[PDB]
């Protein structure tokens, strides 16, 4: 029974920012995935057991992931947004001894000049 | 005065089942992990299945779905229910247990092997 | 010294009066029973759990290997190198050492096989090798391994421990959670706990003298 709640979705101008929020016993890892139209799910950022923050090559030096173990919350600071980042963002959580994969519904983020 | 003892091995035809057993006798404070291994004639030793103290069961791909494992924490005996035997299953089956002697004062285990019971299919 | 601990007591008592001084590249063997405090001692070093009494002073970055193997939705290569720079030779060295070559080769897509939902689920022992691979890859100053061989066969771990903890990471500082006498026989320092309290601390010579 994961129950993942995503927030902070939107439409932004290229060079803009959005913050993403996700809210969820013993958690293995908690991060974000993205699925562009036509493409398959690709990992964006992940936070591990000791706070080891791992990022995607195209997103490195642009986004930040900050977790809250005290509230089971996770935050994606999407800065310097390019239109390539236009996809639906899925919050993920790995939990239990048996490594269960729980996925959020997904928040749409669109980077456009419009 | 710590021995691992095999049972159940021998000669069977293809498509039939077998039940192996392995008991640890002696001064045993606690045993952690137990496992069943096989060494084919000429091949290197390989695991078949392993059982933790709690009873988590990892198996080799070559046996999944057919062979089942079990352990009794009161008798210190690990079993290998070898159903639907293949001629390719023919090897010398050995037994392993991480054993803390009562003699030992710290709760730290030691690797123990069995005699190795021949299984021919 | 890369990691230190003096007069440490923890509450989530879970750890009572912890004392150790590990030098650079030394292997420390944290032993104990189920519930001794080993999985929580590493949380103290990682900063996940803050102490009540005492101080913890460590230098460099930390690489953790969870007791409970966890697979990240993606490829085998992605499970090992995500977020870290792909060094062709650092990668190959970890595969051979963590005994994943055969396991990888037996696949149609090899290290590119997808492990998510609607893909290939890996065994309890393949998950354990991919997780330890993920750890030994990540260039860190301190390596924290929490019962990495818990779901692995004794022949395989023999091959991992000696070619990974004792060869690949031989100049890196390590902390191994293990009961195995065969492993404590190799450590530079040994720490043993029971309900928090450090029942033992020192060389293997001091232990083998009991
Ligand atoms: N995530 C957690 N939150 C709160 N308390 C915890 C947590 N994990 C462990 N504990 C507490 O710590 C105690 C166990 O200590 P710990 O898990 O450090 O032992 P361990 O040495 O890792 O044992 P094992 O061999 O089972 O891994 C438990 O009784 C539990 O109350």
Numbering used by the authors:
A (entry chain C): 1 to 24, 29 to 118
B (entry chain B): 1 to 121
C (entry chain A): 390 to 401, 439 to 636
What does the paper say about this structure?
Cystic fibrosis, is a life-threatening autosomal recessive genetic disorder that originates from mutations in the cystic fibrosis transmembrane conductance regulator (CFTR) gene. The most prevalent mutation is the deletion of a phenylalanine residue at position 508 (F508del) within the first nucleotide-binding domain (NBD1). Although it functions as an ion channel, CFTR belongs to the ATP-binding cassette (ABC) transporter superfamily from a structural and evolutionary standpoint. We report here the development of nanobodies against NBD1 of human CFTR, characterize their interaction with the target, and demonstrate the ability of several of them to thermally stabilize CFTR by 10 °C or more.
For example nanobody D12 was observed in 3 different crystals: the ΔRI-D12-T4 complex (diffracting up to 1.95 Å), the ΔRI-D12-T8 complex (diffracting to 2.90 Å) and the ΔRI-D12-G3a complex treated with papain (diffracting to 3.00 Å). Nanobodies D12, T2a, and T27 recognize the same epitope located on the edge of the α/β-core region, including the first residues of the Walker A motif and the last residues of the Walker B. Although nanobodies T4 and T8 share no sequence similarity in CDR3, the crystal structures revealed that they bind NBD1 in the same location, a groove which includes the γ-phosphate switch loop/Q-loop with an overall binding interface of over 900 Å2. Here also we observed a non-classical nanobody-antigen-binding mode in which the CDR3s contributed only a portion of the interface. The other CDRs also participate in the interface, including a salt bridge observed between D54 in the CDR2 of T8 and K564 of NBD1, and a hydrogen bond observed between D55 of T4 and the backbone amide of F490. Indeed, one of the key features of the T4/T8 interface is that it directly involves F508. F508 is nestled inside a hydrophobic pocket formed by residues located between the second framework β-strand and CDR2, namely P47, L50, A60 and the Cβ of R58 in the case of T8, while for T4 the pocket is made up of L47, V50, A59, backbone atoms of V48 and Y48 as well as the Cβ of R57. Therefore, F508 is clearly part of the binding interface and it is thus not surprising that the binding of both T4 and T8 to F508del-2PT-NBD1 is drastically affected by F508 deletion. Indeed, T4 and T8 completely overlap with the position of the coupling helix of the ICL4, and also with ICL1 and surrounding helices.
